């Protein structure tokens, strides 16, 4: 019995409800309040120019068709109730491939207040494309954006807004950061408008500022290049008589330098421009060549 009153309330809510029509389809604008909690900022793949991110995407709006009065003020229903009511069709403009996690059940929660407010959260992983300029590689910083808006609802029908102050509406968990060779300095949010053929839409923008860590590359390339240059120099102090030793210096230095030059390029994607690493390698190669030229002169 005690469960029957709530069943009656839920049945009363749904009857005569058309989930094909957005709230206030005639007069007003559905104003969706958004919010993000980033449980982990995933790895950044410079080769594919993309990053992964895991979030608790929260959306809230008001639906006057779902007002109720009963013993409790807030209803905490399963995730199969959200398929019966109308919900906004948000999507990520610059996303590549996302998953809405489904184990063990759909990771969604719906909560209905007695005044008709809805809170709709869901856990999902996003792979978003992040354009990168690698001229200063590996001494470079990036701002990887995450833009989302509505599919099929222009600004005249659905408008998004941040739940709290825009500076506090994207929260990054303290312990969640899966970045290996990057540092997350901070984030900034902006809200704008985008024009398209189908109409004019609202876009919520978030930038995550990243700075690359140079520790790996220093040991990997820079020190080996310096040591190869020094070994190439060593040839000067050798006695003039021992020609084969100096020839061996030259050949081994040039061979290892070519191998290092090949190795360095695979660390980043194919780009027509030349990175700082390439300039350093070229200058060191020029120094080796100059040592050989000075050898020939002497």
């Amino acid at each position, epitope marked *: 019995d005690n469960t029957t009153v709530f069943t009656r309330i839920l049945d009363r809510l749904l009857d005569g409800y058309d989930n094909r029509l957005r709230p206030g389809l005639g007069e007003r604008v559905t104003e969706v309040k958004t919010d993000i909690f980033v449980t982990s900022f995933g790895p950044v793949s410079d080769h594919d120019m993309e990053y992964t991110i895991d979030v608790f995407f929260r959306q809230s709006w*008001k639906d006057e068709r779902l007002k109720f009065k009963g013993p409790m003020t807030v209803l905490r229903l399963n995730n199969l109730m959200a398929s019966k009511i109308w919900t906004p069709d948000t999507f990520f403009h610059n996303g590549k491939k996302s998953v809405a996690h489904n184990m063990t059940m759909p990771n969604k929660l719906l909560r209905i207040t007695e*005044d008709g*407010t809805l809170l709709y959260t869901m856990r999902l992983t996003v792979r978003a494309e992040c354009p990168m300029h690698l001229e200063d590689f590996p001494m470079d910083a990036h701002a990887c954006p995450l833009k989302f808006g509505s599919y099929a609802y222009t600004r005249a029908e659905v408008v998004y*807004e941040w739940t709290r*102050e*825009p*500076a*506090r509406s994207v929260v990054v968990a303290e312990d969640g950061s899966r970045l290996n060779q990057y540092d997350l300095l901070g984030q*900034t*949010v*902006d*809200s*704008g408008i985008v024009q398209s053929s189908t109409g004019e839409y609202v876009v919520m*923008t978030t930038h995550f500022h990243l700075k690359r860590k140079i520790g790996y590359f220093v040991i990997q390339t820079y020190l080996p290049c310096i040591m190869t240059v020094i070994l190439s120099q060593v040839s000067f102090w050798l006695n003039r008589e021992s020609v084969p030793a100096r020839t061996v210096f030259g050949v081994t230095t040039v061979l290892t330098m070519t191998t290092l030059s090949i190795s360095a390029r695979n660390s980043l994607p194919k780009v027509a421009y030349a990175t700082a690493m390439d300039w350093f390698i070229a200058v060191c190669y020029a120094f080796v060549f100059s040592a050989l030229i000075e050898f020939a002169t002497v």
Partner: antibody, heavy 116, light 105 residues
Framework: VQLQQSGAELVKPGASVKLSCTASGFNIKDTYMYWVKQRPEQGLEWIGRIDPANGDTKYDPKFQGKATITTDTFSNTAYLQLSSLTSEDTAVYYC???????????WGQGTSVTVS | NIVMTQSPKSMSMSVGERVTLSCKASEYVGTYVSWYQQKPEQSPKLLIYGASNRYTGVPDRFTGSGSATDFTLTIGSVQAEDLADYHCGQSYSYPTFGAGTKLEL
């Protein structure tokens, strides 16, 4: 649509007082209420705000402790309470709404506080 | 926390001349700036919300230009009834306001 703020008042120094901001044409539960103080011939100063849906409040560091903001959701009004009033607190206090990109679209008529 | 500096502190001209007001943010506020005008013995009125959007019931004379930190308000063909203060405020964080600009004559 309209915010009917309290009338003018006079308070002796060192006392405490409270101000009301009645709201009509909408439910305060849907937005944030703001309190702004404007000393004569100076720029506006933000006091604090309240989220009526759950009573969460944030205050400007200067006014921390000095002011307390609460909402009577049933009567649909917000309250500002000033304590330990001094002679530099005499100003005009405004009650402001929020909407459309956090712009303070609507304002009250302004309430005058005078300390002798 | 975020300081908003309005320049000029005061400036004036005759009716019809183009007038521009400049407000600059100490830190980044991404188009969450607003402009209000406060007539004497009156409460502020919202003029421009967002960086550039024009509030309903506002003449097309007013226009706002946005940026990350540098914002401006231009009143093309100022009339003789625009003789009120002008406050720039940012809402990216807990709201703050500029010192205001006085417009006379």
């Amino acid at each position: 649509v309209q915010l009917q703020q309290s009338g003018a008042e006079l308070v002796k120094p060192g006392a405490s007082v409270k101000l009301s901001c009645t709201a009509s044409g909408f439910n305060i539960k849907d937005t944030y209420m703001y309190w702004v103080k404007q000393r004569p011939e100076q720029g506006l100063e933000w006091i604090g705000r309240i989220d009526p849906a759950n009573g969460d409040t944030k205050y400007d560091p200067k006014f921390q402790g000095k002011a307390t903001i609460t909402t009577d959701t049933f009567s649909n009004t917000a309250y500002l309470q000033l304590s330990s009033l001094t002679s530099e607190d005499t100003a005009v206090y405004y009650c402001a709404r929020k909407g459309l990109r956090w712009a303070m679209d609507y304002w009250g008529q302004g309430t005058s506080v005078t300390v002798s | 926390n975020i300081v908003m500096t309005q320049s000029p502190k005061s400036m004036s001209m005759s009716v019809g001349e183009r007038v521009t007001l400049s407000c600059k943010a100490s830190e980044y506020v991404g188009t969450y700036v607003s402009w209000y005008q406060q007539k004497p013995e009156q409460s502020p009125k919202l003029l421009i919300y967002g960086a550039s959007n024009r509030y309903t019931g506002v003449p097309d004379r007013f226009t706002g230009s946005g940026s990350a930190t540098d914002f401006t308000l231009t009143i093309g063909s100022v009339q003789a009834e625009d003789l009120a203060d002008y406050h720039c405020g940012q809402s990216y964080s807990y709201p703050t306001f500029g010192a205001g600009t006085k417009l006379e004559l």
